[PDB]
Amino acid sequence: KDERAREILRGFKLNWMNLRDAETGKILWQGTEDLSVPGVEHEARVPKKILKCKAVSRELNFSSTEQMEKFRLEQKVYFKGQCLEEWFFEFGFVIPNSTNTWQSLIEAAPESQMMPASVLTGNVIIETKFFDDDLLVSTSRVRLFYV
């Protein structure tokens, strides 16, 4: 089970990922680091004007040698160690040895609830748990700078 988790994780690869303003269509951010790798605090700089988008299209392209019955993510957004938000995304079935693109639309809260960049930058950690159904495959973390 920890053995399976490890073969799933050993077989997995976040190839690329984009964040795009869903109104203008422009890409605001893209990385190709396997920000999915556990045991390390990754970092990411995003342009602070991302906070002004009404919605952001996140596009993730991933490979998996192993099949997954129900690939999904749970992402907690921590601010100075305090959980502000909890997001759940489901891809579903993953064919063995595939490469897949997963798109998700993340909609902004009303403006009066958006957090300012100056308060967020450097203080936000996104903690992502990678599951196949109920098997926790890994947990990765990213610290965000809004530059």
């Binding site: 964040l19 957004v77 502000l84 938000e85 993340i106 909609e107 902004a108 009303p110 958006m114 957090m115």
Partner: peptide, 5 residues
């Protein structure tokens, strides 16, 4: 609705 994206 996200407050941080």
């Amino acid at each position: 609705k996200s407050k941080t994206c």
